[PDB]
Design a protein around this ligand. Structure first.
Ligand code: 6GQ
Length: 233
């Protein structure tokens, strides 16, 4: 299952940009599509999403009246338009495919490699800025929220290696996608969630982000992100 995003673009301030996301090895109609951006060296920010079969969409509050998300069901293509562009809109804009796996019936998400848009703050869950350990140690990364988010909604965790798209590490608080080793585990209780990493390896050095829906915003919220350093000491 594959995602083609349109090419990088340089835009003038005040213009609008329309990014495409074309899916492969399937329609498309049994899934949802979310858009998430990341300014250089910064965290992850949800823009909006759509469910193609219903033709409905929802947009993050801070972009209301600026983002338009649409879908062409026949061609398996989703589009995000952002108008009134400014410097602050410089970012990598990611297409995310999400829903339920055929047969096994569990959650999955897949991120595209993103489209760089170059031109010319929002609620986030709380995470420590950094963590560290040496090979073979354990570490825990915390994520604090409130009733309307972590308290009532499923927490996901994402791993971001430098120069790569985020990747799903934990879903539904504590479930591991196939391919993620058992030394990663997730937990949540009340308004807090935690990612535990056993048997630390140098390749685990990355940024880790927790995330959940927030009932008050009616939008998806990411944590501030934690840079994990593995000290080959
Ligand atoms: C009327 C209407 C239509 C469509 C949408 S929606 O596409 O935003 N959506 C399915 C909500 C939702 O539960 N998400 C989307 C955000 N999520 C994301 C987004 C990015 C990465 C991971 N997870 C999953 C939960 C909301 C309302």
């Amino acid at each position: 299952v594959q995602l083609v995003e349109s090419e990088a673009e340089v835009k003038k301030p005040g213009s609008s940009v329309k990014v495409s996301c074309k899916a492969s090895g399937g329609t498309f109609s049994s899934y949802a599509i979310s858009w998430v951006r990341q300014a250089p060296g910064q965290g992850l920010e949800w823009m909006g999403g759509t469910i193609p079969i219903f033709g409905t969409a929802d947009y993050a509050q801070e972009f209301q009246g600026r983002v338009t998300i649409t879908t062409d069901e026949s061609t398996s293509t989703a589009y995000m338009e952002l108008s009134g562009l400014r410097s602050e809109d410089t970012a990598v804009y990611y297409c995310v495919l999400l829903g339920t796996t055929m047969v096994t019936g569990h959650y999955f998400d897949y991120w595209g490699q993103g489209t760089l848009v170059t031109v010319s703050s929002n609620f986030m869950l709380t995470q420590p800025p950094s963590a560290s350990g040496t090979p073979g140690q354990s570490v825990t990364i915390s994520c604090s929220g409130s009733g309307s988010n972590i308290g009532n909604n499923k927490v996901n965790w994402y791993q971001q290696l430098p120069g790569t798209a985020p990747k799903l590490l934990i879903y539904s608080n504590n479930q591991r996608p196939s391919g993620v080793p058992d030394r990663f585990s997730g937990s949540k209780s009340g308004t807090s969630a935690s990612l535990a990493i056993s048997g630390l390896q140098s390749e685990d050095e990355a940024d880790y982000y927790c995330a959940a829906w927030d009932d008050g915003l009616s939008g998806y919220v990411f944590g501030t992100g934690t840079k994990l350093t593995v000290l080959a000491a």
